Amino acid sequence: DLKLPRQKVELVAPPFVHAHEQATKQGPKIVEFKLTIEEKKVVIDEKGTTFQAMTFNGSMPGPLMVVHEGDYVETTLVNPATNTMPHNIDFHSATGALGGGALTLINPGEQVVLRWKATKTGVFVYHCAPGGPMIPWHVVSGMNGAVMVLPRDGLNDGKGHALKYDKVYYVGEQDMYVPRDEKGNFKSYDSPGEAFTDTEEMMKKLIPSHVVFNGKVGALTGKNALTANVGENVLIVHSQANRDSRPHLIGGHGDYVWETGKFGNAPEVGLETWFIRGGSAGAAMYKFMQPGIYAYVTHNLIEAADLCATAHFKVEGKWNDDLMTQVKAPAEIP
Amino acid sequence: DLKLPRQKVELVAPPFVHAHEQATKQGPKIVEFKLTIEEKKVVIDEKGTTFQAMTFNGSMPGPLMVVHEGDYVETTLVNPATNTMPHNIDFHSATGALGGGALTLINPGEQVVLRWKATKTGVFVYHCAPGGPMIPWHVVSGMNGAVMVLPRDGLNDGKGHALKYDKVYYVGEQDMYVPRDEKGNFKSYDSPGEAFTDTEEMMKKLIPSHVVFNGKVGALTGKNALTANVGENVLIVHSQANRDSRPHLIGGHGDYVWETGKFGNAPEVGLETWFIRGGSAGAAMYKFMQPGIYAYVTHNLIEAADLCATAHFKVEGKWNDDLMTQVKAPAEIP
Amino acid sequence: DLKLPRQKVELVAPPFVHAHEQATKQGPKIVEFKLTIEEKKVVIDEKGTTFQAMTFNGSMPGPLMVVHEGDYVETTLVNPATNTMPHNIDFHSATGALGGGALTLINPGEQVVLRWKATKTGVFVYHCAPGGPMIPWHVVSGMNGAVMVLPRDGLNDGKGHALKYDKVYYVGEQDMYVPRDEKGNFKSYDSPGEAFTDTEEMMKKLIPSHVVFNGKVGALTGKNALTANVGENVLIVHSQANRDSRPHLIGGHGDYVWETGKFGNAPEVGLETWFIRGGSAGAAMYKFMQPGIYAYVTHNLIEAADLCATAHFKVEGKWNDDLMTQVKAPAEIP
Numbered sequence A, B, C: 001d002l003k004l005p006r007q008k009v010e011l012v013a014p015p016f017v018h019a020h021e022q023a024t025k026q027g028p029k030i031v032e033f034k035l036t037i038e039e040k041k042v043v044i045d046e047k048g049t050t051f052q053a054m055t056f057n058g059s060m061p062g063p064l065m066v067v068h069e070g071d072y073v074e075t076t077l078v079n080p081a082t083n084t085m086p087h088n089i090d091f092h093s094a095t096g097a098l099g100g101g102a103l104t105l106i107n108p109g110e111q112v113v114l115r116w117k118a119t120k121t122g123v124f125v126y127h128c129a130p131g132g133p134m135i136p137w138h139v140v141s142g143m144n145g146a147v148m149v150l151p152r153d154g155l156n157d158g159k160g161h162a163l164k165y166d167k168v169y170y171v172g173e174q175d176m177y178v179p180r181d182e183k184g185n186f187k188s189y190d191s192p193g194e195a196f197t198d199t200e201e202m203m204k205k206l207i208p209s210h211v212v213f214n215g216k217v218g219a220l221t222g223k224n225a226l227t228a229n230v231g232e233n234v235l236i237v238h239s240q241a242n243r244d245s246r247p248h249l250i251g252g253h254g255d256y257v258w259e260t261g262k263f264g265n266a267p268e269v270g271l272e273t274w275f276i277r278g279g280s281a282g283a284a285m286y287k288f289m290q291p292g293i294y295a296y297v298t299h300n301l302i303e304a305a306d307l308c309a310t311a312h313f314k315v316e317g318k319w320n321d322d323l324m325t326q327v328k329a330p331a332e333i334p
């Protein structure tokens, strides 16, 4: 019935983002994505704590899907028979049927195909929402990601100037609720079903045990640090499907920030810390001016340093002494 | 002394709103409202948990009061002798005397009349504030509502285009603190005074037991779902007098949103989730494009699904397959 | 190497702010500040609870530093030998080296001199950040303040009109984590090092025991109330280095508010309550219209009334009956 060209997208694991154009001369197309649900026990910290995760495509967050305004997004959702629970998908970018959730419920062994038109620009959460108390449980178990709907002319600053990024990263923040036993050690479970009772009791007290980026403490540090060069404009897309976050780039700024994540609104300029409302994604762009290590954190510093919510950037380039200099190194007080 | 025409308003229970004009050719008037305090034990969940509520006009939230910029709002506050405590009222829309709280303290058996000029447009909280530790207790017991001060020319989009709503609903979100006994069951009390000690201990730990719309789990579901039709522009006013909230219309958007609630500022466009700061009201308008059920939630999904914060909309009209379609129904994986 | 005029600033204790110009015809200069770290046991409430504080210049918050865009800020940080721990400083206003933290780590007995160029306007947090789990601990122990970077032409409303304040106050909000013993009394400790284990356990549960302005319950009340006169435009700078806050002036408004704190963005108008994201500072200006007492609170009313987060303003001038009047004093119900 709908006769537009079709384009397949090969999704990639976060924090990377599949190849895409910013400004395009393509007209609308049907863009085809596939997500396969995987339920799996994973390690979430350096002490070896385990967690019953539920994921789109094996990752937390699920992959970033990128399209342009007026595209039709056609998603094949697959729930293999090796899973134990029904799942679905709700796109905050979509209109009707609970974001698609009412049309995508699939038992283990089934798949479904949903199409929605991308009428609203910005970055948006997607997540599983199977019904009732299951909705929060599936989301905080890892079943969330994001989709970016770009204007066809790319991003702008709201004063008529183009904003082009040199690279984009997707940082998905996940609040996790891992119960402790009487001795005070984290509990491990054999199945998501068995984790449910204890996990729900903890969830309703609203305090996470862990808050992590990309699924694990230290995921985006060391070999897996984010990278840039002095002079590069980097877009950081940040989502949180359940709980607020307050991103901050230590040693940098948000030069242009859409904290509510929606490109019909002009970005704010020159922020120190921005706010991602639980159930939303936002985006910040920064042109790096200095080399060295930066940390990207939520600026609840207890969550950042003690609960897991810290990423690093390693930046190459030349140090600018005009911007900052150590006038006198540490020395004994006169 | 002040010689303007007087107009009486018959308040209605939320989520409905008394009849009013958007744009008006009336000039300023003295608009007269009456609020009668009622203290009462109420049921707040489907399990039969009870709660010592304190309310304006018998409802949680108190009713929405609607006026226009430059009107004088004259409120008669009544504290009948059947109540046990002093009460007052603080309007965030008003200027001076702690929002009127310093001029409205009334013991059981008394009434008072306050007038304030509506110099600031937007939606604003009102709440009881009797002094000291009583202030939070009365507010989280249900003594809060909102008032909407419209521009005389009605709402606009900040680019010169009128925004007219077809209907308005008021959703008041209430964080409730109900203590549990040693067995882990919710406690019941014979009076608000007796609930005070246990309730205050719990309040200071900052985690609610319930978060509800319109006073009870499921208040705005079933027979009492909100309603609309495809093509209707609906304004949703949302208040939270004590704690943040992150409203989201599942399957829709906020087409025009004043998250800080104040109409001197242009609305933001095309939001997925917005943020209501504790101690404020905000407003979002959406033109429905699809029929069916929508849920309106705070997008802390634990609060929404497990603690009570979910409303429904039932929308009539024709399904738009261009916006969304199930391409292939659930079927066995090839 | 850098040959600009030098200007020394004598810092003053909050909530006051050192003398400065708004709009200036001075060009860039090197502005020189000195901060001396002090670790000390302090009383934080009227019951006599003690707390192991760590401070810049002996105060919580540290003093407000005021400069203009394009100034170079040269800070001497001193860690006297009477202290027990290493410390450093991170300015959110600065670019590179973790905001200066990577260049300013000093042991007891040492000092360091850092210079950074003020390229971004607004109000910004500064705080200690010595590494790892120490980062949150030093911040919630009191090691944070703010710096205001003004445009050279002073503030404006984003529609071409100047906004000039008659006075400025700095309100620093501090979340404190004081553990309790088995009887339920607050614990006291002999050193910050000894407070660390118990304090960290409590911090990771994310619920503060106290939330205070200017370091103590009631700090900004009584003799130490903030003051103004009817007709005065007052700027209130508010910071929170770790946790969100929702400032509200009871009986007033935010006439012009930069909630994200950055003067490259136009202020919002006519707010009731605004939001300071943890890890940021914001600023609100209000022209007082009515005399009397006002309270300035975070509008989580439990935090304000029960945990310590309330300041007062005493305002002199003539009462305006047009804005508000008690039409009928409290009287028996007919």
Ligand SMILES: OC[C@H]1O[C@@](CO)(O[C@H]2O[C@H](CO)[C@@H](O)[C@H](O)[C@H]2O)[C@@H](O)[C@@H]1O
Pocket (backbone or CB within 6 Å): A151, A156, A157, A158, A159, A160, A263, A264, A265, A266, A267
């Ligand atoms: O950045 C969005 C912001 O910019 C304005 C112009 O100030 O509109 C720009 O962006 C629109 C959406 O991308 C474009 O269609 C428009 O052509 C462009 O000027 C604002 O209207 C908008 O809020």
Ligand SMILES: OC[C@H]1O[C@@](CO)(O[C@H]2O[C@H](CO)[C@@H](O)[C@H](O)[C@H]2O)[C@@H](O)[C@@H]1O
Pocket (backbone or CB within 6 Å): B151, B156, B157, B158, B159, B160, B263, B264, B265, B266, B267
């Ligand atoms: O939506 C408010 C926003 O729109 C602007 C114009 O961009 O002003 C409009 O609204 C004012 C308040 O309602 C009107 O008085 C004005 O006439 C109208 O243009 C902005 O100034 C304002 O922030």
Ligand SMILES: OC[C@H]1O[C@@](CO)(O[C@H]2O[C@H](CO)[C@@H](O)[C@H](O)[C@H]2O)[C@@H](O)[C@@H]1O
Pocket (backbone or CB within 6 Å): C151, C156, C157, C158, C159, C160, C263, C264, C265, C266, C267
């Ligand atoms: O208040 C900042 C806001 O105002 C605008 C004009 O609408 O720019 C003003 O402020 C700039 C920064 O101070 C000035 O450089 C400019 O000259 C002045 O018009 C907006 O661009 C800005 O976002």
Ligand SMILES: O=N[O-]
Pocket (backbone or CB within 6 Å): A180, A181, A182, A183
């Ligand atoms: O050991 N179980 O709580």
Ligand SMILES: O=N[O-]
Pocket (backbone or CB within 6 Å): B180, B181, B182, B183
């Ligand atoms: O049974 N009372 O806690």
Ligand SMILES: O=N[O-]
Pocket (backbone or CB within 6 Å): C180, C181, C182, C183
């Ligand atoms: O008495 N100590 O927990």
Ligand SMILES: [Cu+2]
Pocket (backbone or CB within 6 Å): A054, A086, A087, A088, A128, A129, A130, A138, A143
């Ligand atoms: Cu699922």
Ligand SMILES: [Cu+2]
Pocket (backbone or CB within 6 Å): A090, A092, A125, A127, A279, B248, B299
């Ligand atoms: Cu959702």
Ligand SMILES: [Cu+2]
Pocket (backbone or CB within 6 Å): B054, B086, B087, B088, B128, B129, B130, B138, B143
């Ligand atoms: Cu009351």
Ligand SMILES: [Cu+2]
Pocket (backbone or CB within 6 Å): B090, B092, B125, B127, B279, C248, C299
């Ligand atoms: Cu209030």
Ligand SMILES: [Cu+2]
Pocket (backbone or CB within 6 Å): C054, C086, C087, C088, C128, C129, C130, C138, C143
């Ligand atoms: Cu320190």
Ligand SMILES: [Cu+2]
Pocket (backbone or CB within 6 Å): A248, A299, C090, C092, C125, C127, C279
């Ligand atoms: Cu910081």
